[PDB]
Design a protein around this ligand. Sequence first.
Ligand SMILES: [Zn+2]
Ligand SMILES: [Zn+2]
Lengths: 373, 373
Amino acid sequence: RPRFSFSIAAREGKARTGTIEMKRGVIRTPAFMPVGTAATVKALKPETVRATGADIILGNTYHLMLRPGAERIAKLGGLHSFMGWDRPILTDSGGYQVMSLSSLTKQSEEGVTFKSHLDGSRHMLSPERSIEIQHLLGSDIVMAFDECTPYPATPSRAASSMERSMRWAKRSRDAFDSRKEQAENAALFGIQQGSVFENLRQQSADALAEIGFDGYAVGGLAVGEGQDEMFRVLDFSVPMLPDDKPHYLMGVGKPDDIVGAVERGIDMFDCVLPTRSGRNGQAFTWDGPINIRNARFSEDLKPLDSECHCAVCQKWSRAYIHHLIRAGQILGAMLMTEHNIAFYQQLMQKIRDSISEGRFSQFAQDFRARYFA
Amino acid sequence: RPRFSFSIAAREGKARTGTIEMKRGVIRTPAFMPVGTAATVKALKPETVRATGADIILGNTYHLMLRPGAERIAKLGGLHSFMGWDRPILTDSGGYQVMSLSSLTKQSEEGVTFKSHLDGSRHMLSPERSIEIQHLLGSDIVMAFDECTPYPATPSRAASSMERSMRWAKRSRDAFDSRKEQAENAALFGIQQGSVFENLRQQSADALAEIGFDGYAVGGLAVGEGQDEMFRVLDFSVPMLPDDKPHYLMGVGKPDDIVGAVERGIDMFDCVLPTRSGRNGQAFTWDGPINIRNARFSEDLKPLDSECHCAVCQKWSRAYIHHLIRAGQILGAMLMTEHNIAFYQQLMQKIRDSISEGRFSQFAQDFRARYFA
Ligand SMILES: [Zn+2]
Ligand SMILES: [Zn+2]
């Protein structure tokens, strides 16, 4: 396989379906990437992650640079070897989780220094160091290091952060290119910023296209703006990006967000399954999400979802999983996570097939009618 | 298959190897039974438990009668269907965990009443109710309900509890026999009591043999007496039991306890893997147990054990598991538990083979020399 080849096989409106070919495998798009935090996809062996249909997973750089450390992982043979996943891995830059999880953060034009949330340890992250860490991990798709913009953001502050992000995008590009093994074997994605402002989104798209990247993420969304606003920003933002490269909506999201985002030209997705306030009991079904902890499921012999082809739905009842989750049992988390990731992969497969068959718009309508009935 | 048939294929000294044939499958002896608590073997799918080599698992009655409830499990089709394990299950009587886990316990000749440890709920357990609960769960091997004797115990108190246990053994026998479906499809084991006193152990053995059971457990050991004392009591206690029925040492134990117990005529074992004070990081190896949390393993690329044929040792390093366990990740518990149960099953296989080949005594010596080197 080549280092990187994105090929579009079929289109419908703004939606595309195709493949990304990389050295470690082929990624079918639109793609959902399960998230690995601290070198594991929660409660799943890699073989199970693969069994659900995942072609690629996301690795969080922030926790990895804290534990077990990027240098250590490199010494041990890289992330793939370490965790036992041999297919492509996309790594984030670490910048987002520094801001949401660390303390004592000091930002500057050079980068950010911060104190570990698990320790007292002091750390640094710059465009150069982020790229180096992703190299040490052995990442297949490397994200440029950027400065996130909070929501809401004033025009001035959104512009300043977008401009800094674009300078950091050029630094990320140069750092990536200066390392032969990385430049020849991995890919680099740039990230569009600009908050909800169309002119800033355009300048950001222009800047990134001039630098040139293998793919383009739409950054700074799903930060509290609501689905209507997210969709509105995608409406004008995605067409600004180069058409012939993958479009990645970072951190999104719920099944209905994914469907709407594909309708607007997005090719790649990732998100972490919720857990707080009993949310670890949330299971996706075609008839909408349910919380398996609900007493109504205590004697329900049906599988989590009536159509789902996953191993969990083949083998265990809602009643059993309800019991496990209520009991705080590890197998409860194992089964719930396998089903939810499998559900997402089946959603992406239905999306890919419908686009290929020129009936995605009908699929989107049918999906919404049932999911929100 | 028959309801119950224990056949001894080979012997060496007091050690035996053979099979127990039951309706739901064949159990190879000496056998190790992984423990299911609250209808799950911790962090493992049943298929994985089976893959390690387990022929039977143990179900704890106490937590099940509290959550999800025995009647509910029966309504849902029984424990096997509920948790997805279709091979034999041995259930304990619930009596032990009432004493160690419940509060407000009131004991009498009829049984014990108690308050749930997870709730305020009041519950009752008698010989009759224990047998009924095990029936509702659909247990293949039912344990008689007894009154445990603390250690140390005075001769008088050990005698009183042994005598009560024997009266309760007859009540358990009659309750089991009065239920046609249970009597025809399941088996019933009696439990020898008597603390460390030879005369009491003999009277208990005599009482149980007169009543007649499908198997005989040696109860009241591993309650704090130390291995030397346990072995001393086994020395005289096991020969008192009927030779032609299985001998079960409840709750034992460490690999070296198992080897010594087989040398003294025990056929069946169960125990829960330790977890407190970092003990969830304990991994068995042929060179003795290690704690994977130890910093010395942080860059160790070797598998947990150099000879172990389990999937964990085929696929992941000590360094990776060290990281997972230190990080509190669920996959850490999954991999550690699979390896440890697999190790125990390989130990039992080595024991069975060596007895069959008339070289068990040599195996025991070789095992000890390396395990404690
Ligand atoms: Zn499913
Ligand atoms: Zn192993």
